[PDB]
Every structure is written in structure tokens, then in C-alpha cells.
């Protein structure tokens, strides 16, 4: 199908997310992100990984 499936605008497939705040404990390591899904997008969380 040619229409109403895939956009023709500027949009990346994979996005890189850097931690907003992190913590390096002696036994753990925390990483807090902003998983910002933009306008008119869907994100299946199976594609997300660290």
C-alpha cells in the first residue's frame, strides 16, 4: 500500500536517549530517562532496550 501507511515527513526510526539523572552506588547503578514519544507516533516497548 502506498498511502496512509508510512509517513513522508522527517522522522527517525531509532532514537538515542541519554539519562537525565544517574547514580553510581557501590552495589547498584541508577539511570533515569525521558522516553519522549513525539506527536503522531507509536512506540512498542519491545523495541526499547538499554
Amino acid at each position: 500500500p502506498t498511502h496512509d501507511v508510512t509517513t513522508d515527513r522527517s522522522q527517525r526510526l531509532t532514537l538515542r536517549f541519554i539519562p537525565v539523572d544517574r547514580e553510581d552506588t557501590a552495589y547498584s547503578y541508577k539511570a533515569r530517562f525521558t522516553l519522549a514519544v513525539g506527536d503522531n507516533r507509536v512506540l512498542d516497548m519491545a523495541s526499547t532496550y538499554f
Binding site: 527517525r12 532514537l15 538515542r16 536517549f17 541519554i18 525521558t34 519522549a36 513525539g38
Partner: protein
């Protein structure tokens, strides 16, 4: 939000020479500016040409 990188840098660009030639055009390059370490390489004209 997206971390869409606005810097697309190419290996066959010369950013340094683009800035050395830029300060030639928009200013008296013989003047010394210690803050950007702006002091142009200049030989002595009696040493190069005897």
C-alpha cells in the same frame, strides 16, 4: 526531547581553515586577541626573503 543531533560533520570539510579565512575577512587579522588566543602566524619578511 528527541536528542536529534544537529551537528552532521563530514571528514572532507575543513572547519579550522574555514575559521582562519573567516577572521581574515571580517577583521584586522594583524591584531592580537588573547582570549581566543587569536594571534596569527606571521614570519619575518627579512628572514623569508633575504
Amino acid at each position: 526531547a528527541s536528542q536529534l543531533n544537529a551537528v552532521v560533520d563530514l571528514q572532507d570539510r575543513n572547519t579550522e581553515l574555514s575559521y582562519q579565512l573567516l577572521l581574515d575577512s571580517i577583521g584586522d587579522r594583524t591584531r592580537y586577541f588573547s582570549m581566543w588566543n587569536q594571534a596569527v602566524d606571521s614570519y619575518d619578511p627579512d628572514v623569508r626573503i633575504i
